[PDB]
Ligand binder design. Structure first.
Ligand SMILES: *[C@@H]1O[C@H](CO)[C@@H](O)[C@H](O)[C@H]1NC(C)=O
Ligand SMILES: Cn1c(=O)c2c(ncn2C)n(C)c1=O
Length: 353
């Protein structure tokens, strides 16, 4: 079990002004720290944030959080479940800012909600430095879905923060799971139910959203939404980032207005889906540390059966171990770049059921 700690700095809040926090399981033996960013979409105006507050309140408030969470997949302390980092210090940072971890805005007389995702990550790192992180060799900032995008937006700021606090020895790395989206044409055009590009454009203004400096400098004022797209922000990052991305991500297909029912798929949708997989594969061509199976799924790294999926006979835990070896100073039978070439969901027999 990971134990809840609410942030001692109560100016750093969830959407409703309740304190943000983190779940921690310390490993006294280990100088490895895994900080996992939870996902769960976002909200980008008063009306859709109000709806989220009614039926997804745990993603907007700490008021109802449990005292403990069970570490699963990459957050498991059991080697059987987590061959990769079972002995690491484990941190789960709940997503309660609805801002893809980009926000730097307090609740005030002008703001119904606080969007403090970027500041929550900063505050968790600062408070952990007094709990053993000061002795770390490696800090892996990991995350799934909106948390995966959060890794891309925040990994270099965590590295900068530790450099400026006088910990240049701590190696900051990123693991972005199911956070690598395409600003592609929808299969069918569609209110909130608004394509990611426009929703993110509006979100940044609403959240006072912040993006990595080099990406911000490239795209400039009014175009920072570009930095929420992996293939655009990744090349601007200095920190090593491992990209885990299903070629047919369910969240990508949802925003593209693709709904597979069981009826025969006709030529138009077949070509659309094959084109999406090919586009995803293209964006990963020059990403040296990547795991991209040809599956229709969403998230993997905190799922208990994350060990089961393979690309070219290599599991994700093995790929991550090979990545660790690669960052000592290519390795025989220890690959780090694993992208499926087969063009249809579940052409990989190891895809989740
Ligand atoms: C508390 O958090 C706020 C907002 O991130 C920050 O400006 C302030 O410096 C923090 N104070 C302390 C004591 O950490
Ligand atoms: C750009 N983008 C998306 O496209 C997206 C998303 N979550 C789901 N989608 C589909 N997030 C967090 C995101 O930043």
């Amino acid at each position: 079990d990971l134990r809840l700690h609410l942030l001692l700095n109560t100016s750093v809040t969830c959407n409703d002004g309740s304190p943000a926090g983190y779940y921690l399981k310390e490993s006294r033996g280990s100088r490895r720290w895994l900080l996992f960013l939870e996902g769960g979409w976002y909200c980008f105006n008063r009306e859709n944030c109000d709806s989220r507050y009614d039926t997804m309140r745990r993603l907007m408030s700490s008021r109802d959080w449990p005292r403990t969470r069970t570490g699963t997949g990459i957050l498991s302390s059991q080697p059987e479940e987590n061959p990769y980092w079972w002995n690491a210090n484990m941190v789960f940072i709940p997503y309660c800012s609805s801002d893809v971890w980009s926000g730097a805005s307090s609740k005030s007389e002008k703001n119904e909600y606080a969007f403090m995702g970027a500041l929550i990550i900063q505050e968790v790192v600062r408070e952990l430095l007094g709990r053993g992180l000061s002795g770390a060799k490696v800090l892996l900032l990991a995350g799934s879905s909106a948390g995966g995008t959060g890794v891309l937006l925040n990994v270099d700021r965590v590295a900068e923060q530790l450099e400026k606090l006088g910990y240049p020895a701590i190696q900051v790395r990123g693991l972005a799971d199911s956070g690598w989206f395409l600003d592609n044409k929808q299969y069918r055009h569609t209110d909130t139910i608004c394509a990611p590009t426009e929703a993110i454009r509006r979100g940044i203004r609403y959240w006072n959203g912040v993006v990595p400096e080099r990406c911000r400098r490239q795209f400039q004022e009014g175009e920072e939404w570009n930095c929420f797209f992996g293939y655009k922000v990744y090349p601007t990052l200095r920190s090593p980032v491992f990209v885990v991305q299903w070629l047919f991500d369910e969240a990508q297909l949802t925003v593209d207005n693709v709904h597979l029912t069981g009826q025969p798929v006709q030529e138009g949708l077949r070509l659309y889906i094959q084109n999406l997989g090919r586009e995803l594969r293209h964006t990963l061509k020059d990403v040296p540390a990547s795991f991209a199976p040809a599956c229709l799924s969403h998230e993997i790294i905190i799922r208990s059966h994350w060990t089961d999926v393979q690309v070219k006979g290599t599991s994700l835990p093995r790929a991550l171990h090979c990545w660790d070896r690669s960052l000592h100073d290519p390795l025989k039978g220890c690959p780090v770049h694993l992208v499926d070439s087969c063009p249809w969901p579940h052409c990989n027999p190891s895809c989740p059921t």
